[PDB]
Amino acid sequence: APMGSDPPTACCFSYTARKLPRNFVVDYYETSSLCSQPAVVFQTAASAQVCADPSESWVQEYVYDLELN
Template sequence: MSSLRPLNSALLFLQGSFAGCTQPILLSLPVGSDPPTSCCFTYTAKKIPRNYIADFYETNSRCSQPGVVFTTKKGREICANPAEKWVQEYMDHFELN
């Protein structure tokens, strides 16, 4: 018998690879719950050039840690730490524009 058990509370759909992945992970909750949400489990180690960014959103409060997801002009999503000064500056910039 396998030691793996099905996930009752959430199914994980991964975007990207496990090792060093800074892309958000989509959590799909059971039927009847809120729509799927993105959570960040790791953050980018590098500051993203601001001219690469098209938009951003903050992760859901249900996530295990806070996160900001920047969407690049090429459609890539990158997780960043909202406590970092550059992340806060970018958020302010995009909220004003």
């Protein structure tokens, strides 16, 4: 099980300006670390995935909510 060489990965390049209400957020996932510019990614219902700057409180509260319920 020899890990790959050094294949780049998905690392947030830009964030969405409009906050999508919880109703359109059933799950989420975090970028990585190989990039010194991480962030939090949220899933939806009619899209897929979209990065979000964790610098905004509502983004953190959204994560904290998904951590519980």
